[PDB]
Structures are given as C-alpha cells and as structure tokens.
C-alpha cells in the first residue's frame, strides 16, 4: 500500500459489546489488553477509499475480538460495504498502518479495560524495525527487562531517564522522547553503562538484563524466528506452547522447546538447525519458562507471568 497515512482517522476502543469513541488527543496510544477499530479515510490516485483497521492487543481477551467482530460487520454496513477490511495483531501492523500517527510511534500500555490506573513505576521498550515504524511497548518495570538493542523508558513520579542502549537507533531515540512527551515527564539521558543509583533503585535493584553480543553490538543478518519462519515483529505469543521454534540470531541460533511439544519435534528441530547452518555457531536449546537474559532479549515486550 502506498497512500502516506495522513488521512482522516477516527479511533473506537471495543468496551463489552459497543466501540466507543477514543480521545483524538491520543490516537496512537492503545491498551495492549484492548482491541481497537480504525477507520481510515484516504484519497489516492484521484480515487478516496476507506480503510478499516481491526487492531487487536495481546492481552486483549476472546470476548474483546469476538464483539469486534460485530461491531466491524455492523461500521462496514452503515457505509455500504465499501471499505477494504483488516484485521491486525500487535506487532504485525503493515507499514500503512503505523504510518497513521505522523510519525509519531505506536505506543502500547500495559493493562487495559474489564479502565486500570497506570502504576508510576512503569518501564518502556522502544523498538523500531528496518523502515523505521516504531513501537514503545510496556514491560513489567523489573530490571533484567532491559536490552541493549533498544531505547527504554522510566519513570517514577519523581525521576524520569530515557536509558538508550548501545545497539538503539535514532528512530528509537526519537520515539522514547515522543513517548515522555505524551507521558508528560522530562526526560535524563542515560546511556549504557553511565546509570545513576536512582535508577536500579527504581527498577527494585541492578540485575544483569537481557544481555549478548550480537544484542550489544552496534550495525545491526536480522533475528529471524521459525517454528519447527515468522513474519513481522518478533513476540512472545509468537512462541506456539506445542511447538519447537528456531531463533537464529545470526551469530547463534537457539532452540525454543515450547512445554507440550513432543519429544521428535525437539530431536528434528536440532537436525534442522544443524542443516540450516551448514548450507550458509552455538544451538544453545531452552525450554518454554526457563528463558536466559540472552534469549529473551529478542522479543518486543516480553511478561515473565505470561503463560
């Protein structure tokens, strides 16, 4: 798609059974437990046309997804079926679709309806992808949440950094900065490896985060996730429960053994890496629950209570 985004949006949130109107002061912010309709108004080679985005978070609940069901069939209608559908996951929105704020990232807060009170010890993963779309997604504000690869965002309401890891980009720079714009908070540039006490005194106290080399280094062969060869950005529901997932990071593919998976799957998984490699290296495996620092770094936004 090549219209630039700039169209006139309007933004429901899916409470119960209805979508309700969200704040066109804060189109761009969403409630990761929280699915989302957009609909998207653009002219484009002398033709206008709508879009209808159907956004759903990844906590967001079985119930949330099948009432937007509905609600879209019922939006699609009052405009005479006309629009062009699509429904989106958290984290596998088209260029297009993030092209909707002006620049500005998507950002994601943890949490939600059933609206929660946002705890002011809040931690910020900022991640952009290879054309720049960038997304600011809400960690549990622990201290081994951290990545070199990334910006990240803290915040207590006292102090405010925005720690930039050595592996960040401008992009991600940029969107941190947006995020405490947003946020209403100022900003201390911290680098890594430069932290104040302050700041693993908030985090509840230094731990040695999600830390590797090839995480650390600088230029950038991308993370490329297959199970047993994932589009998009890389999550944690990304990892299917019952299977065997490959994470080669290029300089070291891992082995995600997913709990209920059977026992050949891991004994093929293994075969493949071994062929995947050597028709051009550590296969280090790990288990679904027991995930190494350097493992879950990958990940946009990982919950350690997840499962």
């Known amino acids: 798609m090549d219209d630039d985004g700039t169209g006139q949006k309007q933004i429901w949130r ?7 109107p969200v704040d066109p002061a804060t189109y761009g912010q969403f409630y990761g437990g929280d699915s989302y309709i957009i609909l998207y108004n653009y002219r484009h080679g002398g033709r206008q046309g709508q879009i209808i985005y159907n956004w759903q978070g990844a906590q967001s609940t079985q ?18 079926g006309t629009p062009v559908q699509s429904r989106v996951v958290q984290g596998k929105e088209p260029a297009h679709l993030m092209s909707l704020f002006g620049g500005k990232p998507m950002i994601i807060y943890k949490g939600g309806t059933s609206q929660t009170a946002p705890a002011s010890t809040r931690l910020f993963q900022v991640r952009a992808n290879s054309a720049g779309a960038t997304r600011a997604v809400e960690v549990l504000p622990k201290a081994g949440a951290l990545n070199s690869n990334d910006a990240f965002v803290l915040k207590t309401p006292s102090a405010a950094y925005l720690w930039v890891g050595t592996g960040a980009s401008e992009a991600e720079k940029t969107g941190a900065q947006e995020l405490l714009r947003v946020l209403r908070a100022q900003p201390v540039q911290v680098a890594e490896g430069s932290e104040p006490d302050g700041f693993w005194e908030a985090l509840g106290g230094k731990a040695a985060y999600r830390t590797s080399p090839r995480l650390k280094d600088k230029k950038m062969h991308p993370p490329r ?20 997932m490959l994470l080669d990071t290029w300089d070291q593919v ?15 998984a293994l075969t493949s890496a071994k062929r995947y490699i050597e028709t051009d290296t550590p296969i280090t495996v790990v288990k679904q629950g027991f995930e190494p620092p350097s ?13």
């Open 254 to 268: 891992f082995v995600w053994v997913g709990k209920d998976s059977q026992e050949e799957e891991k004994t093929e």
């Open 225 to 244: 996730l297959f199970a047993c060869e994932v589009p998009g950005e890389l999550m944690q529901e990304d990892l299917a429960t019952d299977d065997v």
């Open 295 to 307: 493992f879950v770094g990958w990940f946009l936004g990982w919950d350690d209570d997840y499962w």
């Open 14 to 20: 899916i409470e119960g059974s209805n979508k309700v």
């Open 63 to 80: 119930d949330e997804v099948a009432a937007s069901a509905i609600l879209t069939a019922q939006l699609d209608e009052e405009l005479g």
